[PDB]
Design a protein around this nucleic acid. Structure first.
Lengths: 100, 206, 151, 50
RNA sequence: GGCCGCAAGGUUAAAACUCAAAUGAAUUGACGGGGGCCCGCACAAGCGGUGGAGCAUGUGGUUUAAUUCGAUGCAACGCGAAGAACCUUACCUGGUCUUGACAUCCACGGAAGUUUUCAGAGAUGAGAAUGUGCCUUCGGGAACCGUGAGACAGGUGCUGCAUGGCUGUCGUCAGCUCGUGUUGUGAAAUGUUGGGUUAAGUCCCGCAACGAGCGCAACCCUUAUCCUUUGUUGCCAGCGGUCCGGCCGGGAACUCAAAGGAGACUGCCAGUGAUAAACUGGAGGAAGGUGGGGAUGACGUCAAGUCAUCAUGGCCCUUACGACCAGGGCUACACACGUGCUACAAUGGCGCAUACAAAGAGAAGCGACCUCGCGAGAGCAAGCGGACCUCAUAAAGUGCGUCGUAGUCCGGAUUGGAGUCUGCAACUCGACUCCAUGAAGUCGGAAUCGCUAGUAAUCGUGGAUCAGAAUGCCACGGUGAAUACGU
């Protein structure tokens, strides 16, 4: 990946950490039943003025060593190529080739 | 065709692992990343000390690292002044208490990583590759190995068309899973491109 | 195959009666691994067939088979660039197999309401020497007879 | 296992986790202190419940 | 031109011009509509499909502001993608910056929480609160926010015909080679060929050869039969309580869990064969001759694939081929091809009610009991980092009714109305629910594919990627066939 895409990801994670509690509060108001029906409207109008990059759904998982956006595994934090390289070198405890 | 990795296929039968710790799913990835950074830093720092292996362990809430080398004096330095700096920087990277230990390699001519590094170093100073390969094979067979193989690939001598060459002596049975084979690789950066090197050493059946 | 010898698989007898011929018939009739359905069909057919003739189910079945078994057939040979039909003898296992296959194939082509009814009708007709199965036997024998010069 | 297209040609791996349980019926102060004052290998996870 | 001949022709016999070769005999391969011997779902013997219909998905073409780049006989076409509404994104139109969105250097002053106006946003302006630590011998500036200048940063830009690494294929085929010796002027040969045998250059005997290496086999995983250890969260023959239920006291026998052992080797019998290697049959045994299934890929071939995972020689751009932002496109549609799902029905459709599994996942997670809604769901709320709680109710099957061969009580494309949930946001372009509507299609032309046993065919269940989005991919069990005379 280019050096700009990784910077994009870092920025996204930072903003999403910054604005976590406010969004939870506003969404709780909107979702809860038996509200004033004006507080609901104001909360909807206020939830869309926060930065777009503060939503945790704008994030994409990338390989921690290369930045690849495809072929990602959650247990290891890497893509298939790097997983295989480390596994054959012997750097992932407990992992080995399987047959049955 | 293509060949399987000897070390990888032998893990658990006759070969040990290079890392030893237990973790759950929320620690695994971070542990791997920390190990990667530790190895990177050490390998950049100790490039003139003939390092061959870095083993990492994580007991309780600490990290302890063992370094396999053929020149322990250079690493230890004057009354530990260098090992101390290494320990401090490693503890900073890991984020937990750290410890460092040093182990000695008696015969550097029977170690696969060191042989490949020496061949690459020679290639970068404009030495003849046939000479380098033959010297490696002769040394290894003289100091007691039961067999060795060496392979080199790229633009050899400056040519325009790439090529691959290899030499062998003794026994090197690669389909036998109880055979003890040491295997490693290395790369050279020259004025015409990259050149690749592979080494196999056979020591007996266990 | 080229260098092989294949043994014979064992077959369990029927649960109601005790014949392996009937088990082979059920197998030849089944589809998609549904053996219970085929067993029900066969038993219903044999029941409705024994009343029509006042004899045992196995006896009626054997009488039906003896009118559909073949004796000679023709194989195709081509070594001189032309196809010839060569008459050969059939052996008993293949006789039984061909008769069963032809009976079931003919039954499936009828136009009655249920498969059991179609099967019963076909078996009765075969006992009386009528239907597609007997016609097939006759055609095979005619083709074998027309080519006796090539035996 | 290929950097590009080929869609067969896969590798398959495994990790095995082994587990054990031990029960002590009548503890004492000395026994509990001794247990809490012990260190073991660097690949084993131990959990103690009272 | 001369001589000879009835003629057809015979005999003697040149030059200009043009090329750097033409030729003989032997050697190693490849090939043959040449010969001999042996193998493989290669044919034969069988069972079920694709090619016609509607829908899903990839490609060619055509269109477009753009429809981003790559893969192309077998060995590209549900392929890189294990998951394109914004993001991802590399493409288009418009709005913006120039030492920079991401690093190291010099020197001029200071930092993070809230909150007001203009912008589509990027980004411009007004305010209010704060004074961190820390040898201050005052030089700390570590940590982290601005700005100014220039060494520099940056590039999914080109060449896989400059490369490392990784991978496809002939092929899990049985071959491919060396040292010393001997033969030939030599290129080379022998060994590796021959008589038997094997799944096998597997083994034995002969022989100018004697030996060794890489491959074959074995050592590694899993499945089938026993016994010794330890029995909770898993197990109940015997013993005893009754609220019926492994529920409670108990038991350590059995199922099962996971660590050490035993067992299968042509080992024993009879015949055949060169006083052989081996072959055909028999006993016992859970299992017999490689018991069944995996992993494991020789020297080399196709300038085979990948500079867009990454790394790298040589070119190329630096107020632009480098940054940032909102909308659109990758989802187009006269048409041609590949891979799939659902059907065309009584071995079936619909209603009622009732047996029997295996293997997995789970803290920004799996979400019971109970109440509301026709339903997708909603409210309140236990338990579980798990042989304990949750996902979670197997389906084909079996019993009883009905439909009666009809484009139908078969099939479920397409379209109108009303809703739910994820998410700043479902117009282009999500999945699901209710009411209504009810298309093609009655077994598929010349071609053509898979499978030798717990296999084909048929029925359900789980996971990775993932806020949400499988008819694809990777795993698990239930019922359970037909046929192999032969080359």
């Amino acid at each position: 990946a280019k050096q700009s895409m990784k910077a994009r990801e870092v920025k996204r994670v930072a903003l999403a950490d910054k604005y976590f509690a406010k969004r939870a509060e506003l969404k709780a108001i909107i979702s809860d039943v038996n509200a004033s029906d004006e507080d609901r409207w104001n909360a909807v109008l206020k939830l869309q003025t926060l930065p777009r990059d503060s939503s945790p759904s704008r994030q994409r998982n990338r390989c921690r060593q290369t930045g690849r956006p495809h072929g990602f595994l959650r247990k290891f934090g890497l893509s298939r190529i790097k997983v295989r390289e480390a596994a054959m070198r012997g750097e992932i405890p407990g992992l080995k080739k399987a047959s049955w | 065709g293509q060949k399987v990795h000897p070390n990888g296929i032998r893990l658990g039968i006759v070969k040990p692992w290079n890392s030893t710790w237990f973790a759950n799913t929320k620690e695994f990835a971070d542990n791997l990343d920390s190990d990667f950074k530790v190895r990177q830093y050490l390998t950049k720092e100790l490039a003139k000390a003939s390092v061959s292996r870095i083993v990492i362990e994580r007991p309780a809430k600490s990290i302890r690292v063992t370094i396999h080398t053929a020149r322990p004096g250079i690493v230890i330095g004057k009354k530990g002044e260098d090992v101390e700096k290494l320990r401090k920087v490693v503890a900073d990277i890991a984020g937990v208490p750290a410890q460092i230990n040093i182990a000695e390699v008696r015969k550097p001519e029977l170690d696969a990583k060191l042989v490949a590094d020496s061949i690459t170093s020679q290639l970068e100073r404009r030495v003849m590759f046939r000479r380098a390969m033959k010297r490696a094979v002769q040394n290894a067979m003289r100091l007691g190995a039961k067999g060795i193989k060496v392979e080199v690939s790229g633009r050899l001598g400056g040519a325009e068309i790439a090529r691959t060459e290899w030499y062998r002596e003794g026994r090197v049975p690669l389909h036998t899973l109880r055979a003890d084979i040491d295997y490693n690789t290395s790369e050279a950066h020259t004025t015409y491109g990259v050149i690749g090197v592979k080494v196999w050493i056979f020591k007996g059946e266990i | 195959p080229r260098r092989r010898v294949i043994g014979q698989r064992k077959i369990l007898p029927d649960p109601k009666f005790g014949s392996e011929l009937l088990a082979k018939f059920v197998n030849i009739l089944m589809v998609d691994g549904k053996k219970s359905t085929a067993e029900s069909i066969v038993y219903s057919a044999l029941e409705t067939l024994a009343q029509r003739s006042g004899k045992s189910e196995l006896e009626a079945f054997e009488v039906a088979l003896e009118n559909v078994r073949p004796t000679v057939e023709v194989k195709s040979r081509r070594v001189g660039g032309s196809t010839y039909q060569v008459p050969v003898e059939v052996r008993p296992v293949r006789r039984n197999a061909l008769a069963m296959r032809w009976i079931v194939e003919a039954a499936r082509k009828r136009g009655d309401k249920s498969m059991a009814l179609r099967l019963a009708n076909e078996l009765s007709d075969a006992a009386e020497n009528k239907g597609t199965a007997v016609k097939k036997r006759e055609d095979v024998h005619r083709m074998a007879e027309a080519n006796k010069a090539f035996a | 296992i290929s950097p590009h297209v080929n869609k067969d040609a896969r590798d398959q791996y495994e990790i095995r986790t082994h587990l054990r349980l031990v029960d002590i019926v009548e503890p004492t102060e000395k026994t509990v202190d001794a247990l809490m004052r012990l260190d073991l290998a660097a690949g084993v996870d131990v959990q103690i419940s009272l």
